[PDB]
Amino acid sequence: REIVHIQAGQCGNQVGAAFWSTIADEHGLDSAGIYHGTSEAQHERLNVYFNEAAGGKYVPRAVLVDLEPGTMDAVKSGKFGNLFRPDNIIYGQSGAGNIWAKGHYTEGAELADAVLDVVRREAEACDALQGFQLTHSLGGGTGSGMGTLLLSKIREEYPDRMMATFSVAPAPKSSDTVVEPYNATLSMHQLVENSDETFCIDNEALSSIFANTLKIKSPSYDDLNHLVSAVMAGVTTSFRFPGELNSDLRKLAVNMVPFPRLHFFMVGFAPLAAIGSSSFQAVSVPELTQQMFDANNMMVAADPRHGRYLTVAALFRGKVSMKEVDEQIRSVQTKNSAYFVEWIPDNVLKAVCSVPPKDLKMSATFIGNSTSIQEIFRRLGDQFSAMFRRKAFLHWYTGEGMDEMEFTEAESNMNDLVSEYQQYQEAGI
Amino acid sequence: ENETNINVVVRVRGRTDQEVRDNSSLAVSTSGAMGAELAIQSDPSSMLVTKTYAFDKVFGPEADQLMLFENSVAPMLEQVLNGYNCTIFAYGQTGTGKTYTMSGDLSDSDGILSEGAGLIPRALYQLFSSLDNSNQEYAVKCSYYELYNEEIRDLLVSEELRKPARVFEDTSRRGNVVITGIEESYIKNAGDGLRLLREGSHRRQVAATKCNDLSSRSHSIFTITLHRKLRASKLHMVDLAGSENIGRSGAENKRARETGMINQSLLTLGRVINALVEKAHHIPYRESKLTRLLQDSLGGKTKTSMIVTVSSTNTNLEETISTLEYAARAKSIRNKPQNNQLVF
Amino acid sequence: MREVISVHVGQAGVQIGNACWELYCLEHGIGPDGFPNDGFGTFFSETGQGKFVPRSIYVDLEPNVIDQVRTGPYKDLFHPEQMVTGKEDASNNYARGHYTVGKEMIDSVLERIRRMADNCSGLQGFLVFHSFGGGTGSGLGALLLERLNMEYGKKSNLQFSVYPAPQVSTSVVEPYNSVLTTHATLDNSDCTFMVDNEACYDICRRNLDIERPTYENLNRLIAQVVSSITASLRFAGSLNVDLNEFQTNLVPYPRIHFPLVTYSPIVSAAKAFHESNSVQEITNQCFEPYNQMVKCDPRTGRYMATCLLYRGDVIPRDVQAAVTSIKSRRTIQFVDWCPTGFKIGICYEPPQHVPGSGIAKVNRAVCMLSNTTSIAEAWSRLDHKFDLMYSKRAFVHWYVGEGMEEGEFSEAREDLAALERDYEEVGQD
Ligand SMILES: C/C(=C\c1csc(C)n1)[C@@H]1C[C@@H]2O[C@]2(C)CCC[C@H](C)[C@H](O)[C@@H](C)C(=O)C(C)(C)[C@@H](O)CC(=O)O1
Ligand SMILES: Nc1nc2c(ncn2[C@@H]2O[C@H](COP(=O)(O)OP(=O)(O)OP(=O)(O)O)[C@@H](O)[C@H]2O)c(=O)[nH]1
Ligand SMILES: Nc1ncnc2c1ncn2[C@@H]1O[C@H](COP(=O)(O)OP(=O)(O)NP(=O)(O)O)[C@@H](O)[C@H]1O
Ligand SMILES: Nc1nc2c(ncn2[C@@H]2O[C@H](COP(=O)(O)OP(=O)(O)O)[C@@H](O)[C@H]2O)c(=O)[nH]1
Ligand SMILES: [Mg+2]
């Protein structure tokens, strides 16, 4: 059971050094790549991400593709440079320009032939693929313009396996570049169709965690990307160890997705507290779940209280039994009858992994599916609306060769993705 | 008028000698005089008699081409000459006759005409026939391609060319869902209709089931552009593939694509009319490429006909009656026929 | 020898099956090798040396829980060619379960049965227990009976498949994978013993006073009623209740074959100490609904036919003097057309307790089985759910997208409601 990992883009690069650092520490690998086992769980399921080599040397399934040749040297010539086969590392010369219409016009047309060729032997050298991760961004060009074209090949290539993309979202307020309403919705056009699902993450929401819970007002991006690697590990936590139930990446997506259009999700994590709030916190299974339904613990700034939960999958790392979970959720589904969908009854999935984390007693990885996500999209389209009617910031896309009316196709795709959620945010049928 | 005009007809196939003489199949369909509600029963003088389904034109294993064609297609052939878009498509279980319904025979006796050739070669000539004697200028174009696993292959050309990016909308109308990146061809007469459709219908992917060696898997779609004179009414002749069961295919992973993804869009064809029994706050037309194209067809500005070809042999009771609820539920939806003289 | 065999499909087949064979070996006093009442090893195949092979086969599509058995304290017990693993899980998809990946794996399983079937002296019938909620045991077990009852014909078929209920749930396609299974169980199985995960849990909270029970504490309750039926014959007792006899004393009609399970006494450590154990007060426990295995209301409905399997030191006249204290005295009337309602046998030897559960040693034990009319509120819980899960056709594209036509969804609710039309008709005075 292997999956294929892609870090397409600059944000793909700096999440991956945050990703694989907490994965290699989780199975007991060092910072170099040699093995140091704790018990048999770390001996048998290193067959999830890692291909073998001579001795106890392990190589992760990864391709890390960028167009900007600078920041790849921060992980190649930088630390963990002995933990990637440099044939897998592949990157051109010219920068994108924070342009969707350039990473999908010309640069993918000059790398994604040779990028996909490296993906060939990584896929063939396992027995059974499971998923195909392409954790990227939507803001800049490389993570988006290649992030769609490298996506759209694989559905034409491997029409069976699954897609788990962790594309980060632009912010309604704290946005970072100026091409964000164009560089999102073009990528949102390709990502609704070909991707199986995605997990949105917004930085403006992520800043609210450190400003309310951990009480740090001066973090770093390297500190911030360190936090998302919880739920990166949190998804395949149920599989990489001896579990008790419902252990698969597929067992999530077969019943987290009611219709094959919506596919989008909200992410929460628990517990987390500063060193001042450390010991005074207790670690209880009812005490965790009350954190997981707060709007101060989500990774997208849309209010979940404002919407309704279609589906909820709870994935727990540690020592936790069955009705410990549910009996607190019983009181939750009484206090929140305006928050649960009625026409889909019994909307709670649960998943228990029987291995604790490091330096923790229990943990709770949360997957949510609100109807609040259309509001960010309506926020995104409203940002799109004033940007397009003037047709400013335009000829750096058509000048590369994308059609003018092709945007209106994407907005019509974008608007329709918004337009399915208003059935269900007010749903008595 | 502006009524609830949605045309639905049912014509079952005929049993063979080995089937019912072994199986003693259902007694659910009549000899097919006119459309009337029959029954749902098996072991009829016993405790399985449930209900009937109200019909428009039920026909048993008795109906022929010109019995159907003069009453179903021909009152809408005049609507095409009247300047209106029309839509005709068939549906049913696999191996029942819905490929026979659109394109039936390849006899093609080119002295005069063919016999039993299906609705499209009857609607081919009988639009070229009446157009020859109505004292106006005419120009005829067509485009014939297929739909297969969320992909489009041009059945007009055998070359390996496809769409550049995506299916396009327009800012002119809402009912347009235009498909560029694909060729339409010019047609002079009735003698050029079958001339391109012959090799054109051969370009599709006729797979082989355990049941039939002819029950294909693609979605044949036959579009017509009529530039008579200044005006143009597009006409949709659409084939649909079958609702394939699990065990009656022998399908491996190469066959499961044209099993699963085909049934994926046929299920999608369910909810796009299951949401029109009450027409709530969203109409999910954009779920697959089969229903984006039929957006102006299904409940839109276009007159729409529908064929439900089922099997009367007891190969099932699962979707023996389940497929007839599609015409039964979504009968009562309305449209709006609009005129087309394109002002230059 | 009155021989029996086992199969196990899904993790419910594994985890209940892990607890079944543990409790068996302590009854027959064997460890991994054996022998640290004379023989009677109908569960076991005898080798020429002493390593008794349990007549069983585990079937799972995902090699996760099978590694636990092949590495834990029971890898030195089984026949490692018999423990067949799959490649990729059904993953809560009955179409993947019953048809697609199961077809590519049944033909390394069905022939594996036949070698174990042709080694039988004379085989009576056997047991196929799994879950309805999950993927593989719902789907592959559905094909596993119809590809067996086609072959072996007049031989008996039982199943102890575990059943979902609205309080505690794990997956959210549990309405779909139950009612898509019950077509297979209607015409293939002679009988089934459905059991809840909730009433199984609640007795571990109330009548065991264990605060947070785990699944092995759930399963050791479950496997004990399994021991109290088959191997109850395999101790020499004063009476005999044969596997044929359940197929006479509990089934008036070929469709009414859904008994319930009730076990007694289930008393924790500090409470049997300070308690006696009569014959009569323990049979009084049996007709209390607090020892019930499926969340139903038996005092509302009537009983078509009952069965009481006593274990331990039992005199057979407190059978008769106390059964009329239940039958002739109490409020809960029987069916007017069933004239007696009771069948009862006495097995002399005591039940065996595990040394690591809250349950304690007791000199007598009753495994109540009864075909009631109050189980009609079990199917109404699912068919009301299966209604609203279907009325918008949500979560259907993961089934029809695999190959199942929707025509079974018509016949599921048509047959299941008509199956409830016999409980309202036979139970109608
Ligand atoms: C103390 C503690 C949890 C806890 C609950 S009860 C108990 C006893 N311990 C957390 C770890 C908790 O696992 C997360 C989710 C660890 C989450 C990972 C992030 C990076 C840290 O939580 C974040 C605050 C940090 O960057 C620093 C401050 C460096 C970390 O040390 C903080 C930090 O990680 O400490
Ligand atoms: N009785 C019992 N039921 C359990 C136990 N653990 C889980 N279950 C039930 O088993 C269901 C899951 O069934 P599975 O065996 O995993 O189904 P599957 O087809 O094997 O699915 P996967 O193997 O996980 O792909 C859960 O929904 C629970 O209802 C247990 O210890 N005892
Ligand atoms: N009503 C009918 N009358 C006479 N022949 C029929 C009829 N229906 C089907 N056939 C015969 O059935 C064969 C064609 O198979 P067909 O039944 O059309 O498949 P299908 O139902 O259309 N499936 P598919 O092609 O996958 O969409 C030909 O031999 C036809 O003559
Ligand atoms: N360093 C860092 N930046 C992030 C992260 N998530 C999102 N971003 C920002 O999101 C935007 C996306 O830009 P990006 O695709 O990386 O730039 P590109 O090189 O043009 O593709 C930039 O402003 C990034 O800084 C993260 O985890 N770390
Ligand atoms: Mg057909």
mmCIF file of C-alpha atoms in Angstrom, chain B residues 46-192:
data_model
loop_
_atom_site.group_PDB
_atom_site.id
_atom_site.type_symbol
_atom_site.label_atom_id
_atom_site.label_comp_id
_atom_site.label_asym_id
_atom_site.label_seq_id
_atom_site.Cartn_x
_atom_site.Cartn_y
_atom_site.Cartn_z
ATOM 1 C CA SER B 46 -51.882 -14.795 -6.939
ATOM 2 C CA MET B 47 -50.423 -12.361 -4.395
ATOM 3 C CA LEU B 48 -48.223 -10.333 -6.766
ATOM 4 C CA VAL B 49 -50.375 -7.649 -8.456
ATOM 5 C CA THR B 50 -49.343 -4.164 -7.364
ATOM 6 C CA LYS B 51 -49.975 -1.192 -9.664
ATOM 7 C CA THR B 52 -50.039 0.232 -13.184
ATOM 8 C CA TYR B 53 -48.024 2.975 -14.889
ATOM 9 C CA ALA B 54 -49.853 5.633 -16.910
ATOM 10 C CA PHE B 55 -48.452 5.883 -20.430
ATOM 11 C CA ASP B 56 -48.536 7.853 -23.668
ATOM 12 C CA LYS B 57 -47.636 5.252 -26.327
ATOM 13 C CA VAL B 58 -47.041 1.723 -25.108
ATOM 14 C CA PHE B 59 -46.126 -0.779 -27.800
ATOM 15 C CA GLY B 60 -45.360 -4.457 -27.397
ATOM 16 C CA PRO B 61 -43.352 -6.605 -29.811
ATOM 17 C CA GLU B 62 -45.676 -5.447 -32.591
ATOM 18 C CA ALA B 63 -44.758 -1.895 -33.586
ATOM 19 C CA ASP B 64 -42.695 -0.975 -36.636
ATOM 20 C CA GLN B 65 -40.892 2.048 -38.081
ATOM 21 C CA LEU B 66 -43.622 3.984 -39.886
ATOM 22 C CA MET B 67 -46.161 3.226 -37.147
ATOM 23 C CA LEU B 68 -43.974 5.145 -34.682
ATOM 24 C CA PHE B 69 -42.279 7.592 -37.039
ATOM 25 C CA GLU B 70 -45.378 9.301 -38.443
ATOM 26 C CA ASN B 71 -46.871 10.005 -34.994
ATOM 27 C CA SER B 72 -43.815 10.631 -32.784
ATOM 28 C CA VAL B 73 -41.021 12.146 -34.870
ATOM 29 C CA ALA B 74 -43.047 13.611 -37.750
ATOM 30 C CA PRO B 75 -45.153 16.083 -35.657
ATOM 31 C CA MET B 76 -41.775 17.305 -34.372
ATOM 32 C CA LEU B 77 -40.088 17.224 -37.792
ATOM 33 C CA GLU B 78 -42.457 20.025 -38.782
ATOM 34 C CA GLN B 79 -41.457 21.845 -35.586
ATOM 35 C CA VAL B 80 -37.850 21.695 -36.802
ATOM 36 C CA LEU B 81 -38.961 23.247 -40.084
ATOM 37 C CA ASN B 82 -41.083 25.657 -38.006
ATOM 38 C CA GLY B 83 -37.884 27.035 -36.469
ATOM 39 C CA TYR B 84 -37.518 25.215 -33.162
ATOM 40 C CA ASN B 85 -34.862 23.091 -31.488
ATOM 41 C CA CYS B 86 -35.925 19.542 -30.674
ATOM 42 C CA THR B 87 -34.377 16.693 -28.710
ATOM 43 C CA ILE B 88 -34.930 12.952 -29.171
ATOM 44 C CA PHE B 89 -33.057 10.294 -27.203
ATOM 45 C CA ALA B 90 -33.579 6.698 -26.109
ATOM 46 C CA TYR B 91 -33.039 5.028 -22.745
ATOM 47 C CA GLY B 92 -33.468 1.653 -21.089
ATOM 48 C CA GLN B 93 -31.741 -1.496 -19.948
ATOM 49 C CA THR B 94 -28.824 -2.753 -22.030
ATOM 50 C CA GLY B 95 -29.667 -5.222 -24.767
ATOM 51 C CA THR B 96 -33.253 -4.027 -25.211
ATOM 52 C CA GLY B 97 -33.259 -1.976 -28.405
ATOM 53 C CA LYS B 98 -32.292 1.607 -27.705
ATOM 54 C CA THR B 99 -29.418 1.386 -30.165
ATOM 55 C CA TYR B 100 -31.919 -0.242 -32.528
ATOM 56 C CA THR B 101 -34.226 2.703 -31.799
ATOM 57 C CA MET B 102 -31.866 5.422 -33.030
ATOM 58 C CA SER B 103 -29.920 3.582 -35.753
ATOM 59 C CA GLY B 104 -31.477 0.241 -36.596
ATOM 60 C CA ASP B 105 -30.344 -1.301 -39.867
ATOM 61 C CA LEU B 106 -27.450 -1.195 -42.313
ATOM 62 C CA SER B 107 -29.348 -2.661 -45.281
ATOM 63 C CA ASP B 108 -29.164 0.692 -47.106
ATOM 64 C CA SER B 109 -30.679 -0.324 -50.447
ATOM 65 C CA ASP B 110 -29.558 2.812 -52.246
ATOM 66 C CA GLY B 111 -31.988 2.433 -55.130
ATOM 67 C CA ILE B 112 -34.732 4.146 -53.137
ATOM 68 C CA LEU B 113 -34.498 3.759 -49.356
ATOM 69 C CA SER B 114 -33.751 1.284 -46.582
ATOM 70 C CA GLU B 115 -36.138 -0.623 -44.326
ATOM 71 C CA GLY B 116 -36.075 -0.844 -40.548
ATOM 72 C CA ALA B 117 -33.125 1.537 -40.403
ATOM 73 C CA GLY B 118 -34.118 3.281 -37.159
ATOM 74 C CA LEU B 119 -35.506 6.706 -36.384
ATOM 75 C CA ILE B 120 -32.499 8.737 -37.569
ATOM 76 C CA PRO B 121 -32.393 7.440 -41.215
ATOM 77 C CA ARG B 122 -36.165 7.889 -41.351
ATOM 78 C CA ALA B 123 -35.722 11.396 -39.968
ATOM 79 C CA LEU B 124 -32.811 11.850 -42.371
ATOM 80 C CA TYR B 125 -34.748 11.559 -45.650
ATOM 81 C CA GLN B 126 -38.100 12.880 -44.412
ATOM 82 C CA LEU B 127 -36.529 16.222 -43.597
ATOM 83 C CA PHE B 128 -34.702 16.320 -46.938
ATOM 84 C CA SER B 129 -37.899 15.247 -48.712
ATOM 85 C CA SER B 130 -40.285 17.994 -47.578
ATOM 86 C CA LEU B 131 -37.524 20.606 -47.829
ATOM 87 C CA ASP B 132 -37.176 19.949 -51.565
ATOM 88 C CA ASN B 133 -40.738 21.156 -52.188
ATOM 89 C CA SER B 134 -41.135 24.272 -50.028
ATOM 90 C CA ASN B 135 -39.767 26.971 -52.431
ATOM 91 C CA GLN B 136 -36.967 28.331 -50.219
ATOM 92 C CA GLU B 137 -33.181 28.205 -50.076
ATOM 93 C CA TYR B 138 -31.663 25.609 -47.748
ATOM 94 C CA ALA B 139 -28.245 24.662 -46.380
ATOM 95 C CA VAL B 140 -27.593 21.528 -44.318
ATOM 96 C CA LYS B 141 -24.727 20.866 -41.911
ATOM 97 C CA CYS B 142 -24.255 18.096 -39.369
ATOM 98 C CA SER B 143 -21.841 16.910 -36.710
ATOM 99 C CA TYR B 144 -21.711 13.354 -35.367
ATOM 100 C CA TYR B 145 -19.429 12.373 -32.484
ATOM 101 C CA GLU B 146 -19.495 10.268 -29.313
ATOM 102 C CA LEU B 147 -19.361 10.578 -25.535
ATOM 103 C CA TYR B 148 -17.288 8.007 -23.673
ATOM 104 C CA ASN B 149 -15.945 8.198 -20.090
ATOM 105 C CA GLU B 150 -16.221 12.012 -19.739
ATOM 106 C CA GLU B 151 -14.481 12.345 -23.130
ATOM 107 C CA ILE B 152 -15.500 13.317 -26.654
ATOM 108 C CA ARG B 153 -14.326 11.572 -29.823
ATOM 109 C CA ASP B 154 -15.345 12.884 -33.236
ATOM 110 C CA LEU B 155 -17.021 10.112 -35.191
ATOM 111 C CA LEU B 156 -16.865 12.204 -38.366
ATOM 112 C CA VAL B 157 -13.090 11.982 -38.748
ATOM 113 C CA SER B 158 -10.797 9.072 -37.986
ATOM 114 C CA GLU B 159 -7.847 11.374 -37.309
ATOM 115 C CA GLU B 160 -6.502 11.793 -33.790
ATOM 116 C CA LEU B 161 -7.650 15.342 -33.015
ATOM 117 C CA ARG B 162 -9.661 16.497 -30.019
ATOM 118 C CA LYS B 163 -10.826 19.542 -28.095
ATOM 119 C CA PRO B 164 -8.139 21.996 -26.904
ATOM 120 C CA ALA B 165 -9.338 22.691 -23.337
ATOM 121 C CA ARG B 166 -13.035 22.449 -22.392
ATOM 122 C CA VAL B 167 -16.665 22.714 -23.482
ATOM 123 C CA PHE B 168 -17.641 26.380 -23.770
ATOM 124 C CA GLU B 169 -20.578 28.553 -22.776
ATOM 125 C CA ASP B 170 -21.441 31.855 -24.450
ATOM 126 C CA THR B 171 -22.602 35.336 -23.512
ATOM 127 C CA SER B 172 -25.332 35.226 -26.176
ATOM 128 C CA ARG B 173 -27.850 32.764 -24.711
ATOM 129 C CA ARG B 174 -28.218 30.492 -21.708
ATOM 130 C CA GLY B 175 -29.503 27.510 -23.702
ATOM 131 C CA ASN B 176 -26.291 27.288 -25.720
ATOM 132 C CA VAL B 177 -23.749 24.784 -24.491
ATOM 133 C CA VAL B 178 -21.467 24.975 -27.497
ATOM 134 C CA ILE B 179 -18.781 22.385 -28.194
ATOM 135 C CA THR B 180 -15.832 23.712 -30.155
ATOM 136 C CA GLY B 181 -12.604 21.937 -31.047
ATOM 137 C CA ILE B 182 -14.549 19.499 -33.214
ATOM 138 C CA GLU B 183 -15.606 19.524 -36.848
ATOM 139 C CA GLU B 184 -19.036 19.879 -38.363
ATOM 140 C CA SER B 185 -19.408 18.846 -41.996
ATOM 141 C CA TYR B 186 -21.479 20.157 -44.882
ATOM 142 C CA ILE B 187 -24.285 18.129 -46.475
ATOM 143 C CA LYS B 188 -25.863 18.868 -49.860
ATOM 144 C CA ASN B 189 -28.692 16.354 -50.099
ATOM 145 C CA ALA B 190 -30.353 13.226 -48.759
ATOM 146 C CA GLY B 191 -27.595 11.343 -50.610
ATOM 147 C CA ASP B 192 -24.969 12.877 -48.305
#
